[PDB]
Every structure is written in C-alpha cells, then in structure tokens.
Amino acid sequence: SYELKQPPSVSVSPGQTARITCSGDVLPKKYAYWYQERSGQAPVLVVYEDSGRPSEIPERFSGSSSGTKATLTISGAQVEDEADYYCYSDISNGYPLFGGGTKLSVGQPKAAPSVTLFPPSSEELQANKATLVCLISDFYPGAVTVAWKADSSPIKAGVETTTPSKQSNNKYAASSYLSLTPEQWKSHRSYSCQVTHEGSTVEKTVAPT
Amino acid sequence: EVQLVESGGGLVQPGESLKLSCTASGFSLSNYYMTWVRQAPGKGLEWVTNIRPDETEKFYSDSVKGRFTVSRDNARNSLFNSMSLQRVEDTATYYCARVSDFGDYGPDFWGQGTLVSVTSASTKGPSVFPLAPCSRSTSESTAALGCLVKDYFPEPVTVSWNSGALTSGVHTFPAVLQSSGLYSLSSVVTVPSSSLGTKTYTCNVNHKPSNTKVDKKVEP
Ligand SMILES: Cc1cc2nc3c(=O)[nH]c(=O)nc-3n(C[C@H](O)[C@H](O)[C@H](O)CO)c2cc1C
C-alpha cells in the first residue's frame, strides 16, 4: 500500500504564510494535487500537477513540489482559508491516493489541551468489557492528535476519537476512547493516551491498580 | 456551469445494498472520466473508483473491489455506484467528482455528496459507569470525577449533576460514534479532593429516545 504522509495539523496567523507538506515514495514520478475542504462542504481543487493553479483559486495559494515532497504554500492566510487540505497522487502503477489530510487554523489566543485519562471501571469490567476514556479540554486552535499506547507500544484496533468541538468559552473539546477486553486491560501493565497539539504533547497514563 | 448532484445515499444495514447516483450538468459527461471518493465522518478522503468515459475500464479500491460496481450513462449525464454486501466501514459520505484531464488523474469538481449510514443500531439505552482515577490523580487538590455514558442510540443524551444543583466544573463531552453504530460520551466535573469525601457527586443521565434515566453517584 502507500502513503501520502501529510501533517495532521497546521495553524497560522491572519496575514502570514502557511506551508503544508505531503511526503511520498512515488511523488518524484507522479504529480501531486491539493484540495481545500471547508467543514461540511465538497472538497475543492486548488493545485494540480504539482504547481498548476485553477482560475478561481487566488494566487496566494501556491502549489510546488520536488523529489518526494509536495508543498501547498498559502500566503496571506485568510479567515476563509480555514479548512482541511488533502494531497492527491498515486501509486507506482496508477491507483489514486489521498493524504491523511491537514487542518489549517487561524486566530485567537493559542491554548494547550487539558487531558484527563480514566481506566476501565471495575463495574464495566463485570460486564465483560473495558473502556479507557481520554478527555481533551480547553485547547486552541481546534486541532489535536490522539495516539494510544499499550505499554509503550502503539495500537490502533479499538480507538474512536471525536472531532474537535467548540466549548462555550470559544476553546475546543475532544474525546478519545480505547476499547479493550477485560483480558487485555489486565494483560499489559500500562495504557497511555497521548494528545499532541501544536507540537506540544501531553501524555497521561493509567495502569491496573 | 459545472455542477454535480449525488443522491441515493441513505440508511441501511450490513450486507444490505444501495445504489448511489450522480447526475451532472454544465458539461458533457462523456468527455470525462468520473470517480467516487468517500469520507467517513471526521476522517480523510478515501478513493473508491474511476470509470473511463467509454466504460471499458473500471477501477476500484481494494476495500470495495468486488462489492461495488461503477457505471455510467453519458447520454443521461449520469454516474452510478451500486454497493452490495454493505459493511459498517463503508459508512461515510459518497462524493462523485469529475476527473480532471491533466497530470495524473485528480478530480477538479466535486459534488456535495450523499450520506451513507449503515447500522443495525436500534434504540439502546446508555450504560453508566463511574469515572474515577486510581491512586495517583486521587492525591491532587482537585481531581476529576465523571460518568461514562456508554453504548446508546440515537442521540441526544442529557447529563447533569446533583439533579441540576452542581454546574461549575461540569464538562459534558460530545458523543463519540463508535464503530458499532452506538454513541458514548463522558461527563466530568472537576472538584477539590479535599472536601471530596464529604460532598456527593451524582450525574443524572437522561436519554428520552430510549425513555431511560439513570442516576449514578460516583465516589472517590
Ligand atoms: C487505477 C487506475 C486509474 C486510472 N484512472 C484514470 C483516469 O481517471 N483518467 C485517465 O485519463 N486515465 C486513467 N488511467 C489510465 C488509463 O487506464 C489508460 O491506461 C490510459 O488512458 C491508456 O489508454 C488509470 C489507470 C489506472 C491503473
């Protein structure tokens, strides 16, 4: 399989330039595209064949590329430029791809997330189920990354994270849940919920006790 | 000018079938290549298929190859995506787009999409489990206590504390839509661990859709 390795999140101040990358093993042989998708809205083309640019896309959106990294550079960041950006290209035998996508935010005072981790209640355990809850509160801009760790080892099977939500205080709220079996919860000796936001990483851990 | 309109998306159960349709206007469908790209709520864009204008070639993502089949009717400016043997993971919003004609094949114009939900979720009530730390976070000046409102359906759920008395420190998080088409959400109320063993903390979960009301008193 193959990946358009694309940074999950990116934020910039109104008026300054923003740069989104997109690594890839076959990008040196295949073109790269960029799409802009505003919340609950069809994606829109902003860049094609690495540098092309549609006649509806303002010049400040500059596509470029080289080797194995395409880069969507958005200058003079606007409040309207806040949305998700995805790169496109394909494998070494034509099948199309998409990057993980990237979140582009603008302005208000930046804030770090309040992370709280809860272990499985002995009660839910009696129900032959285990569920670790990771609440992420008061962060800004509204974009975070949640990775779960089984004793320092990663894991993906059993994770359900929410989409950043706007609290009443104009900051954001997120929640992530790792579902295990009563046996796994006791199997390992520690589970950890690490929430990285703006390069910053908060990592709370819990262990059977 | 260029315009794409999806439809057919709806709510169905695993294994069941569904046939989406995309009708275009503003251009000759027969002059372009078409694709369907889907996106599960809060997730990235995932490519599904591409279909040659003369329909002599059809490409599908491994995830859907065999179950989904693309088809067109350049005469009726229509693209079609018949999905069969539905899986939960196929749940997402289906976008049909016009495939550009330069560089490799990215699309240029996307329709707004049609939502495709797929579950057996009926109307479960929420289970409510206590949310308290082990021994580390219990030794703070103000830890957090909460209620885990697990597996319910459909939204919404109302959480409160001490029948509405307690309000400060309360933070009811947005529900997470677990794989099994069932919602879950937590609600924590941050309070001092000093006067913790003297006061009562009781969330009152309300789920009218299920006609359920639970009151769990969390202790330290
Ligand atoms: C997975 C896959 C997707 C393709 N998608 C397109 C497309 O959208 N548009 C296009 O002109 N050619 C596409 N092609 C190339 C096309 O099949 C064909 O080889 C050329 O037009 C040669 O006739 C694709 C090839 C593959 C393997």
Coordinates of N, CA and C in Angstrom, one line a residue, chain A residues 29-31 33 35 37 41-45 48-49 56 86 88-90 93-100 116-119 121 123-124 127 129-131 133 135-138 160-163 165 167 173-175 177 179 204-209, chain B residues 37 39 41-47 50 59-61 65 95 100 102-113 128-137 140 144-146 148 150-151 171 173-179 184-188 216:
Chain A
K29 N 7.8 10.6 -9.3 CA 7.4 10.1 -10.7 C 6.0 10.5 -11.0
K30 N 5.2 10.9 -9.9 CA 3.8 11.2 -10.1 C 3.4 12.6 -9.7
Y31 N 2.4 13.2 -10.3 CA 2.0 14.5 -10.0 C 1.4 14.6 -8.6
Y33 N -1.6 16.8 -6.2 CA -2.7 17.8 -6.3 C -3.1 18.3 -4.9
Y35 N -6.4 19.8 -2.5 CA -7.8 20.2 -2.4 C -8.1 20.9 -1.0
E37 N -11.1 21.6 1.6 CA -12.5 21.2 2.0 C -12.8 21.9 3.3
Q41 N -18.5 20.5 3.5 CA -18.5 21.0 2.2 C -17.7 20.2 1.2
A42 N -18.1 20.1 0.0 CA -17.4 19.3 -1.0 C -16.0 19.8 -1.1
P43 N -15.0 19.0 -1.3 CA -13.6 19.4 -1.5 C -13.5 20.3 -2.7
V44 N -12.4 21.1 -2.8 CA -12.2 22.0 -4.0 C -10.8 21.9 -4.4
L45 N -10.6 21.9 -5.7 CA -9.2 21.8 -6.3 C -8.5 23.1 -6.2
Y48 N -2.9 21.6 -9.1 CA -2.8 20.4 -9.9 C -1.4 20.2 -10.5
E49 N -1.1 19.0 -10.9 CA 0.2 18.7 -11.5 C 1.3 19.5 -10.7
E56 N -9.8 30.2 -10.2 CA -10.8 30.7 -9.2 C -10.1 30.6 -7.9
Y86 N -6.0 18.3 1.5 CA -5.6 16.9 1.2 C -4.8 16.9 -0.1
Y88 N -3.2 14.7 -3.3 CA -3.6 13.5 -4.2 C -2.5 13.2 -5.1
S89 N -2.4 12.0 -5.5 CA -1.4 11.5 -6.4 C -1.7 10.0 -6.6
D90 N -0.7 9.1 -6.8 CA -1.0 7.7 -6.9 C 0.2 6.8 -6.8
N93 N 1.7 2.3 -10.0 CA 1.0 1.6 -11.1 C -0.4 2.1 -11.0
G94 N -0.5 3.4 -11.3 CA -1.7 4.2 -11.4 C -2.9 4.3 -10.3
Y95 N -2.9 3.5 -9.3 CA -4.1 3.7 -8.4 C -4.0 5.0 -7.6
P96 N -5.0 5.8 -7.7 CA -5.1 7.1 -6.9 C -5.0 7.0 -5.4
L97 N -4.4 8.1 -4.8 CA -4.3 8.2 -3.4 C -4.7 9.5 -2.8
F98 N -4.7 9.5 -1.5 CA -5.0 10.7 -0.7 C -4.2 10.7 0.5
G99 N -3.8 11.9 1.0 CA -3.0 12.1 2.2 C -3.9 12.0 3.3
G100 N -3.4 11.9 4.5 CA -4.2 11.9 5.7 C -5.0 13.1 5.9
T116 N -7.3 14.3 30.5 CA -7.6 13.5 31.6 C -7.8 12.1 31.2
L117 N -7.2 11.1 31.9 CA -7.3 9.7 31.5 C -8.0 8.9 32.5
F118 N -9.0 8.1 32.1 CA -9.7 7.2 33.1 C -9.5 5.8 32.7
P119 N -9.4 4.9 33.7 CA -9.2 3.5 33.4 C -10.6 2.8 33.3
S121 N -13.8 1.0 34.6 CA -14.4 0.8 35.9 C -14.5 -0.6 36.2
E123 N -16.7 -2.0 37.4 CA -18.1 -2.2 37.1 C -18.2 -2.6 35.6
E124 N -17.8 -1.8 34.7 CA -17.9 -2.2 33.3 C -17.2 -3.5 33.1
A127 N -19.0 -6.4 33.2 CA -19.9 -6.5 32.1 C -19.1 -7.1 30.9
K129 N -16.3 -6.1 29.5 CA -15.9 -5.0 28.6 C -15.0 -4.1 29.3
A130 N -14.1 -3.5 28.6 CA -13.1 -2.5 29.2 C -13.1 -1.3 28.3
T131 N -13.1 -0.1 28.9 CA -13.1 1.1 28.1 C -12.3 2.2 28.8
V133 N -11.1 6.0 28.9 CA -11.6 7.3 28.4 C -10.6 8.4 28.5
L135 N -10.3 12.4 27.9 CA -10.9 13.6 27.7 C -9.9 14.7 27.5
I136 N -10.1 15.5 26.4 CA -9.2 16.6 26.0 C -9.9 17.9 26.0
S137 N -9.6 18.7 27.0 CA -10.3 20.0 27.1 C -9.5 21.3 27.1
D138 N -10.3 22.4 26.7 CA -9.7 23.8 26.6 C -8.6 24.1 25.6
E160 N -11.6 5.2 19.0 CA -12.6 6.1 18.4 C -12.4 7.4 19.0
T161 N -11.9 8.4 18.2 CA -11.7 9.7 18.7 C -12.7 10.6 18.2
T162 N -13.1 11.7 18.9 CA -14.1 12.6 18.4 C -13.4 13.7 17.5
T163 N -14.3 14.5 16.9 CA -13.9 15.7 16.1 C -13.9 16.9 17.1
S165 N -14.5 19.9 19.2 CA -15.7 20.6 19.5 C -15.5 22.0 20.1
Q167 N -16.3 24.7 22.7 CA -16.9 24.8 24.0 C -17.5 26.2 24.0
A173 N -13.0 21.1 22.6 CA -13.2 19.9 23.4 C -13.1 18.6 22.5
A174 N -12.3 17.6 23.0 CA -12.2 16.4 22.2 C -12.2 15.2 23.2
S175 N -12.6 14.0 22.7 CA -12.6 12.8 23.5 C -12.2 11.7 22.6
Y177 N -11.6 7.2 22.8 CA -11.9 6.0 23.6 C -11.2 4.8 23.1
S179 N -11.2 0.9 23.4 CA -12.0 -0.3 23.9 C -11.1 -1.6 23.9
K204 N -0.9 11.3 29.5 CA -1.4 10.7 30.7 C -1.4 9.2 30.6
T205 N -1.1 8.5 31.7 CA -1.1 7.0 31.7 C -1.8 6.4 32.9
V206 N -2.3 5.2 32.7 CA -3.1 4.6 33.8 C -2.6 3.1 33.7
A207 N -2.7 2.4 34.8 CA -2.3 1.0 34.9 C -3.1 0.3 35.9
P208 N -3.5 -1.0 35.6 CA -4.3 -1.8 36.6 C -3.9 -1.8 38.0
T209 N -4.6 -1.0 38.8 CA -4.4 -0.8 40.2 C -5.5 0.0 40.8
Chain B
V37 N -15.3 9.2 -4.4 CA -14.4 9.3 -3.3 C -15.3 9.4 -2.1
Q39 N -15.8 9.6 2.3 CA -15.3 10.1 3.6 C -16.2 9.8 4.8
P41 N -17.3 10.1 8.6 CA -17.4 11.2 9.5 C -16.1 11.5 10.2
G42 N -15.5 12.7 10.1 CA -14.3 13.1 10.7 C -13.1 12.4 10.3
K43 N -13.1 11.8 9.1 CA -11.9 11.1 8.6 C -11.5 11.7 7.3
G44 N -10.4 11.2 6.8 CA -9.9 11.7 5.5 C -10.7 11.3 4.3
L45 N -10.2 11.7 3.1 CA -10.9 11.3 1.9 C -10.3 10.0 1.4
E46 N -11.2 9.1 1.1 CA -10.7 7.8 0.6 C -11.2 7.6 -0.8
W47 N -10.3 7.2 -1.7 CA -10.7 6.9 -3.1 C -11.4 5.6 -3.3
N50 N -12.9 4.8 -10.3 CA -12.7 5.7 -11.5 C -13.3 4.9 -12.6
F59 N -12.0 1.1 -12.3 CA -11.0 0.8 -11.2 C -11.6 1.0 -9.9
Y60 N -11.3 0.0 -9.0 CA -11.8 0.1 -7.6 C -10.7 -0.1 -6.6
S61 N -11.0 0.5 -5.4 CA -10.1 0.4 -4.3 C -10.2 -1.0 -3.8
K65 N -13.5 -3.4 -4.0 CA -13.4 -4.3 -5.2 C -14.2 -5.5 -5.1
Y95 N -18.9 11.1 -2.5 CA -18.7 12.2 -3.4 C -18.4 11.6 -4.7
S100 N -10.2 15.3 -13.5 CA -9.5 16.3 -14.4 C -8.9 15.5 -15.5
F102 N -5.6 16.5 -16.7 CA -4.1 16.8 -16.8 C -3.4 16.1 -15.6
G103 N -2.0 16.1 -15.7 CA -1.2 15.4 -14.7 C -1.8 14.1 -14.5
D104 N -1.5 13.4 -13.4 CA -2.1 12.1 -13.3 C -3.6 12.5 -13.1
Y105 N -4.4 11.6 -12.6 CA -5.9 11.9 -12.6 C -6.6 12.5 -11.4
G106 N -6.2 13.6 -10.9 CA -7.0 14.2 -9.8 C -8.4 14.8 -10.2
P107 N -9.3 14.9 -9.3 CA -10.6 15.5 -9.8 C -10.5 17.0 -9.7
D108 N -11.4 17.7 -10.4 CA -11.4 19.1 -10.4 C -12.7 19.6 -9.7
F109 N -13.8 19.0 -10.0 CA -15.1 19.5 -9.5 C -15.8 18.3 -8.7
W110 N -16.1 18.6 -7.5 CA -16.8 17.6 -6.6 C -18.2 18.0 -6.4
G111 N -19.1 17.0 -6.2 CA -20.5 17.3 -5.9 C -20.5 17.4 -4.4
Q112 N -21.7 17.8 -3.8 CA -21.6 18.0 -2.4 C -21.7 16.6 -1.6
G113 N -22.0 15.6 -2.3 CA -22.0 14.3 -1.7 C -23.4 13.8 -1.2
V128 N -24.2 3.3 32.4 CA -23.5 4.4 33.0 C -22.5 3.9 34.0
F129 N -21.2 4.0 33.7 CA -20.2 3.6 34.6 C -19.4 4.8 35.2
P130 N -18.9 4.6 36.4 CA -18.2 5.6 37.2 C -16.8 5.9 36.7
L131 N -16.5 7.2 36.6 CA -15.2 7.6 36.1 C -14.4 8.3 37.3
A132 N -13.4 7.5 37.8 CA -12.6 8.0 38.9 C -11.2 7.4 38.7
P133 N -10.2 8.2 39.1 CA -8.8 7.7 39.0 C -8.3 6.7 40.0
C134 N -7.2 6.1 39.8 CA -6.7 5.0 40.6 C -6.2 5.6 42.0
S135 N -4.9 5.9 42.1 CA -4.4 6.5 43.4 C -3.5 7.7 43.1
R136 N -3.0 7.8 41.9 CA -2.1 9.0 41.6 C -2.9 10.3 41.6
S137 N -3.9 10.4 40.6 CA -4.7 11.5 40.4 C -5.7 11.8 41.6
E140 N -4.5 14.7 44.4 CA -4.4 16.1 44.0 C -5.3 17.0 44.8
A144 N -10.7 14.9 39.1 CA -12.0 14.9 38.3 C -12.7 13.6 38.5
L145 N -14.0 13.7 38.6 CA -14.9 12.6 38.7 C -15.9 12.7 37.6
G146 N -16.4 11.5 37.1 CA -17.3 11.6 36.0 C -18.1 10.3 35.7
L148 N -19.4 7.7 32.6 CA -19.2 7.2 31.3 C -20.6 6.7 30.7
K150 N -21.9 5.0 28.2 CA -21.6 4.1 27.1 C -22.7 3.4 26.3
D151 N -22.4 3.1 25.1 CA -23.3 2.5 24.1 C -24.8 2.8 24.1
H171 N -18.3 19.4 32.7 CA -17.9 19.4 31.3 C -18.4 18.1 30.6
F173 N -18.7 16.1 27.6 CA -18.1 16.0 26.2 C -19.0 15.5 25.1
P174 N -18.7 15.8 23.9 CA -19.6 15.4 22.7 C -19.4 13.9 22.6
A175 N -20.5 13.3 22.2 CA -20.6 11.9 22.0 C -19.7 11.4 20.9
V176 N -19.2 10.2 21.0 CA -18.3 9.6 20.1 C -19.2 8.5 19.3
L177 N -19.1 8.5 18.0 CA -19.9 7.5 17.3 C -19.1 6.2 17.1
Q178 N -19.1 5.3 18.1 CA -18.3 4.1 18.0 C -18.6 3.3 16.7
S179 N -17.7 2.4 16.3 CA -17.9 1.6 15.1 C -19.3 1.0 15.1
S184 N -21.5 7.1 22.7 CA -20.9 7.1 24.0 C -20.4 8.5 24.3
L185 N -20.4 8.9 25.5 CA -19.9 10.2 25.8 C -19.6 10.2 27.3
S186 N -18.7 11.1 27.7 CA -18.4 11.1 29.2 C -18.8 12.5 29.7
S187 N -18.8 12.6 31.0 CA -19.1 13.9 31.6 C -18.4 13.9 32.9
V188 N -17.5 14.9 33.0 CA -16.6 15.0 34.2 C -16.9 16.4 34.9
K216 N -26.2 7.8 38.7 CA -25.0 7.1 39.3 C -24.3 8.0 40.2

